[PDB]
């Protein structure tokens, strides 16, 4: 069998090493290079979702080698409902980035005139760190790249973004890496757990065997420890997947780098956090999960209300889509962690709906503020008249993340909505007052940025508003399709996902309540 | 055979073109929306004579299209179920929207972007048909939801006026509100049912409790409030007026409005049930005809007197609803009515303000009964079905819904009655102001304005919709005949007649014949006045929406605010703040251990010979200390 998760997560890595090896003169040729690389996982990712069979078993397309045996770690790759979704997220989404960053480091001096194919080599290696994260079926494996997608990330926030970059990269990195590192603590414990127990050969890092392990009862290990080993995972996809109050490095890296690295910060990559709770904290610690859903539960629709409400506070529109995001990831964690069908199927859609519409709105955001030259929302008006395309675009990305049910995000946060209900209806309630604040912050910056009059120096002056040229117009078409497509018909996504979800619902003994 | 689904398809689709093809069909789009607007339509027709064609269950047509969210126990299928109650509302909504359209085409022939126009008006009407024709609550959330967008997009039309975002956006926020309530409405419905859909939710009603069941009610009659501008989420509906003319002819007829309505008497089954929640629609419907009746008699602008109107006639129309099967079908029978002759009202109000320079102020207008006869004779149509007369539609829905609400019985009878008669009574004198102040009287005309009879192409939507306001209400109460085509969806019900019909009918026209004669007095007999004149407390009152746009001001707006810096400044102070403390601690422990880098050999020297530490600590781990 060919090993198509091994070339789908290789490729975007030998394809940025090449990049960056171009010689200087060859800045489109990088460019375009970088594209087709893009387009290639893209292609790899097409047939292995189109190979993939939801009915089948859960694992599929799995790769197994000896990696480092002495560490008891495997290069174990394989790919789930949950995995799958979002690898087909990320691949469709880095050759957008790429398309939409057409000319984001065309300024960058220096560098030995690298800086265009530094940055698509940045990019392409985070996707390819994105991609095995999700595939990898090791813990050790998983959280290799899960620590070291950060760093390729930090240096395309530090390098290329606004003034302020090196101390958004320097909190993005630390913030990160401080969680990552309780990670490392987590899993040290979990492999020294694993050698004490005799359900193991020695110390392990397969996934599905310790799963599997745990699941039978055969790897029963004293609660306290396993409650310190879900604390330190849980706390490093917190800071990953900006779960409140952790958020606080997301708006500044998000609103200094560049709108393409910021979207793959936030849509992306910040997505492995989420999806490391949905398959390694439930899975690995079931019983210390169920123990603290409470609190995470709690923290979770915190996150949404308090980052919704300080969106609605921001002055920059690109620290406001910033906070909107980590409202956005309070939903995913809260329909993570109420364990229930419904719920998990929800948070896992709405990880696809808010890549691609944190994605599309981020972006033209950042078109915007790159026609104009402040992030400020006072600072435009009447935007509308001057580019009507521009601002409807906009309109269409924010009912998106408003959650329209004409758009693909209210199915997935009403699924999480519901799921919530039936286990936590005050929880479930207190979200729900997000469906109204998103609407505010989303209206009322419309309102002040593009309805109006046209500000000074919008229409006229040196720096006018003009209208997407066509590139940014096949960057922005493509997310609201899918947008429309996932809303009006998200049944093939939850094909794949429904399976999945079941099977970890089963693994970890929850089930969805039954109705009174 | 045409399926049902065509029904959306038409006018999304033509939509779709609008909002896609862009300025390409800038100059034949109008054209493209009406001709949607006019298909669907005719769809609908065909589809209520096939209804018509079928009798007993037969009558309704379920169709389900797809799968939709097959997650786990929620198996949620795409349908429509166009039933009874249904087609009443999509005939409804296709014909007044494609009139509405055909008098937009000369309403907004003389402004730019009419394409764009005719592409959100066919959305609205797409989503009205969606929220209605959808055989469970999520699609019908998707169609509220839709119907919220679609307005929010008609009402920021003209984006470049300040006022009109501003409405947009509170129209959408106060929806939303709604909205929400809906949601939790439909968590509950899932959690204790495990069902969305119209048939599941309905046969597992019995069941639950009543405390289940009112909470269902209660939110789904906030949802309403939040479409049918119900208070306290009734203050958008005076700001929605900045957009054009026939925006709010559409909103106020049909779909936005009418989804309160639609959402209460659909949902018959459950309120029912629940006693408790039938009570809270009630009272939420009198008080709010109340307000609006009173909002109505002090505004100025012919938008926002006949805003007032229209709330004032929803809440009429929730009242009915809340009083169970007794008045479910009269209240249908009240909004068709309604959707006729207030939109004849609107377009009207539409056509009086293109002639008068896009003038909304009722006091500069005046004397214009001879200045426009179709439009004078057009709003005077829809003005005596308003008001109620023996012969105009209203008269039978109006008394319909008294009699149905003063026999509830009781000291809730009695206030129910009570309320509806004052209701009347202010409708009838706020009108008449109204007309009165456009039609008769001195001119009043300033800027040297010059009407002109408006247009066939708005013209005719005109008389279309006067010959509505005429003869809908009298074709559907005569024999009962829209009683009983609802009888097999809506509760069945007998006629407890605890007061002669004749003597409601008599007390009702009493009550308009002294408010029309208040209203002359003042207005008729005594010269309109050009300026605002003072007056009791109550008056000013009034003139700001019985300071209902305050009161949001005041708590929410201010209340938002003020968390909204709380939250920042946790924000910026304590959540970053724990970080900043690390970092500095961490800062001011690495000087100071650099301080122990002196630098002179002998002090480095010292600290190895802190080595008697080591020796120290190795005795006393025998030590056992
Ligand atoms: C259960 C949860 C319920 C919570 C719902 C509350 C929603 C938010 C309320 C504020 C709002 O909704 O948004 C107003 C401002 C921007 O205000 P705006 O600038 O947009 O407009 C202003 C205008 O200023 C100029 O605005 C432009 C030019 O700038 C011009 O066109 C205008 O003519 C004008 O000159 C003008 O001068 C100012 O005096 C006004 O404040 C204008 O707004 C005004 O809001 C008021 C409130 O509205 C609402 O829906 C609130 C009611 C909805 C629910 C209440 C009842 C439900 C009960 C259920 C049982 C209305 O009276 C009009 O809506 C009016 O319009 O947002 C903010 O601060 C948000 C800050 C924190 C909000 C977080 C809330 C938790």
Redesign the interface.
């Given at each position: 069998t060919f090993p198509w998760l091994t070339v789908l997560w290789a490729v975007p890595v030998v394809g940025a090493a090449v990049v960056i090896l171009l010689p200087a003169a060859q800045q489109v040729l990088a460019k375009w290079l970088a594209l087709a690389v893009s387009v290639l996982t893209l292609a790899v990712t097409a047939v292995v979702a189109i190979g993939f069979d939801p009915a089948a078993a859960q694992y599929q397309f799995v790769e197994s080698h000896r990696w480092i045996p002495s560490f008891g770690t495997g290069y174990i790759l394989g790919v789930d409902g949950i995995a799958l979704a979002l690898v087909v997220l990320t691949a469709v989404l880095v050759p957008l980035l790429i398309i939409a960053g057409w000319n984001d480091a065309s300024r960058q001096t220096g560098l030995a005139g690298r800086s265009v194919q530094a940055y698509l080599a940045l990019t392409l290696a985070v996707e390819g760190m994105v991609l095995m994260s999700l595939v990898a079926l090791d813990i050790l494996l998983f959280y290799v790249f899960f620590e070291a997608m950060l760093i390729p990330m930090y240096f395309l926030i530090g390098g290329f973004g606004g003034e302020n970059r090196s101390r958004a990269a320097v909190?993005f990195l630390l913030?990160n890496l401080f969680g990552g590192l309780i990670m490392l603590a987590a899993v040290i414990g979990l492999y020294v757990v694993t050698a004490g127990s005799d359900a193991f050969a020695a110390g392990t890092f397969d996934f599905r065997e310790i799963v599997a392990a745990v699941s039978s009862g055969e790897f029963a290990v004293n609660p306290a420890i396993m409650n310190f080993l879900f604390l330190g995972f849980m706390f490093a996809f917190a800071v990953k997947a900006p779960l409140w109050?952790f958020?606080?490095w997301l708006p500044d890296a998000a609103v200094e780098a560049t709108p393409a690295s910021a979207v793959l910060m936030m849509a992306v990559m910040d997505k492995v956090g989420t999806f490391g709770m949905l398959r390694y904290c439930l899975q690995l610690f079931p019983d210390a999960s169920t123990y603290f859903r409470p609190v995470v539960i709690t923290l979770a629709a915190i996150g949404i209300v308090?980052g919704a409400?300080?969106a609605?506070?921001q002055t920059d529109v690109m620290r406001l889509i910033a906070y909107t995001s980590i409202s956005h990831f309070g939903f995913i964690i809260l329909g993570i962690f109420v364990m229930?069908?419904?719920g998990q199927?929800?948070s896992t859609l709405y990880m696809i709906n808010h890549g691609i519409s944190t994605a599309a709105l981020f972006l033209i955001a950042g078109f915007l503020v790159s026609r104009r030259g402040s992030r400020l929302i006072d600072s435009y008006g009447?935007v509308?008249?001057v580019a009507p395309?521009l601002a409807?675009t906009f309109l269409v990305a924010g009912?998106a993340t408003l959650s329209?049910?004409?758009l693909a995000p209210?199915?997935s946060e009403?699924?999480v909505?519901?799921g919530?209900?039936?286990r936590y209806?005050v929880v479930?309630?207190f979200a729900?007052?997000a469906?109204?604040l998103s609407?505010?912050y989303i209206?009322?910056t419309?309102?002040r940025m593009?309805?109006?009059?046209?500000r000074d120096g919008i229409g006229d002056g040196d720096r006018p508003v003009r209208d997407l040229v066509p590139r940014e117009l096949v960057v922005v078409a493509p997310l609201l399709a899918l947008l429309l497509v996932l809303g009006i018909?998200?049944?093939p996504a939850?094909?794949v996902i429904?399976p999945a979800v079941?099977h970890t619902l089963t693994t970890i003994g929850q089930t969805?309540?039954?109705?009174? | 055979w045409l399926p049902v689904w065509l029904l959306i398809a038409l006018p999304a689709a033509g939509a779709t073109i609008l909002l896609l093809a862009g300025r390409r069909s800038d100059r034949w789009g109008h054209l493209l929306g009406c001709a949607m607007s006019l298909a669907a339509f005719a769809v609908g027709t065909v589809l209520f004579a096939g209804m018509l064609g079928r009798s007993g269950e037969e009558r309704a047509v379920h169709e389900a299209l797809f799968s939709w969210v097959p997650v786990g126990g929620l198996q949620v299928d795409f349908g429509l179920q166009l039933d009874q109650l249904s087609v009443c509302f999509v005939l409804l909504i296709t014909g007044v929207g494609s009139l509405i359209h055909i008098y937009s085409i000369g309403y907004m022939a003389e402004d730019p972007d009419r394409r764009r126009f005719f592409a959100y008006l066919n959305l609205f009407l797409a989503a009205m048909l969606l929220l209605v024709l959808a055989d469970n609550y999520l699609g019908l959330y998707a169609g509220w939801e839709g119907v919220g967008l679609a307005s929010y997009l008609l009402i920021g039309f003209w984006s470049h006026k300040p006022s009109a975002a501003t409405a947009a956006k509170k129209a959408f926020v106060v929806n939303r509100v709604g909205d929400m309530g809906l949601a939790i409405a439909l968590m509950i419905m899932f959690a204790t049912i495990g069902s969305i859909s119209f048939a599941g939710v309905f046969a597992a009603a019995p069941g639950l409790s009543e405390a289940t069941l009112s909470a269902i009610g209660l939110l789904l009659l906030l949802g309403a409030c939040g479409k049918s501008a119900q208070v306290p989420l009734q203050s958008w509906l005076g700001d929605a007026m900045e957009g054009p003319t026939p925006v709010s002819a559409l909103i106020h007829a049909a779909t936005m409005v009418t989804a309160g309505v639609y959402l209460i008497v659909r949902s018959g089954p459950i309120f029912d049930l629940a006693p408790t929640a039938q009570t809270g629609v009630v009272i939420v419907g009198a008080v709010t005809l109340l307000f609006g009746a009173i909002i109505g008699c002090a505004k100025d602008d012919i938008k926002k007197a006949l805003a007032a109107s229209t709330m004032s006639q929803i809440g009429y129309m929730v009242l009915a609803a809340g009083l169970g099967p007794a008045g479910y079908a009269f209240a249908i029978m009240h909004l068709l009515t309604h959707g006729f002759f207030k939109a004849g009202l609107f377009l009207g109000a539409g056509s009086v303000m293109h002639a008068m320079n896009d003038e909304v102020n009722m006091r500069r207008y005046g004397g214009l009964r001879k200045v426009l006869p179709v439009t004078f004779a057009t709003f005077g149509l829809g003005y005596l079905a308003i008001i109620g007369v023996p012969p105009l539609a209203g008269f039978f829905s109006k008394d319909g819904i008294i009699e149905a609400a003063l026999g509830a019985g009781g000291a809730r009878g009695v206030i129910l009655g009570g309320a509806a008669i004052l209701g009347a009574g202010i409708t009838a004198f706020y009108m008449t102001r109204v007309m009165l102040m456009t039609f008769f009287g001195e001119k009043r005309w300033a800027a040297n304005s010059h009407p002109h009879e408006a247009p066939a192409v708005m013209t005719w939507p005109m008389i279309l919709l006067a010959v509505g306001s005429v003869v809908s209400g009298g074709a559907l109460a005569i024999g009962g005949t829209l009683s009983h085509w609802l009888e097999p969806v809506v509760g069945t019900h007998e006629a407890h007649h605890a007061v002669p019909v004749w003597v409601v009918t008599a007390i009702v026209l009493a009550v308009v014949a002294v408010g029309i004669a208040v209203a002359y007095r003042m207005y008729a007999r005594q010269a309109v006045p050009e300026e605002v004149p003072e007056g009791s407390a109550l008056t000013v009152a009034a003139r700001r929406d019985l300071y209902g746009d305050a009161f949001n001001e005041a708590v929410f707006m201010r209340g938002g605010q003020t968390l909204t810096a709380a939250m920042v400044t946790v924000d910026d102070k304590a959540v970053d703040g724990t970080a900043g403390g690390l970092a500095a601690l961490v800062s001011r422990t690495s000087d100071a251990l650099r301080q122990v880098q002196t630098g002179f050999a002998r002090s480095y020297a010292l600290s190895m010979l802190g080595g008697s530490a080591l020796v120290v600590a190795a005795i006393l781990a025998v030590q056992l200390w």
């Open positions: 909190k913030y109050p958020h606080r308090y409400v300080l609605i506070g229930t069908s419904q199927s929800g009447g509308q008249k395309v409807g009912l329209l049910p004409g209210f199915i009403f699924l909505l519901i919530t209900f039936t209806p479930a309630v729900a007052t469906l109204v609407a505010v209206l009322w419309y309102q593009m309805t109006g009059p046209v018909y998200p049944k939850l094909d429904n079941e969805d309540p039954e109705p009174t | -």
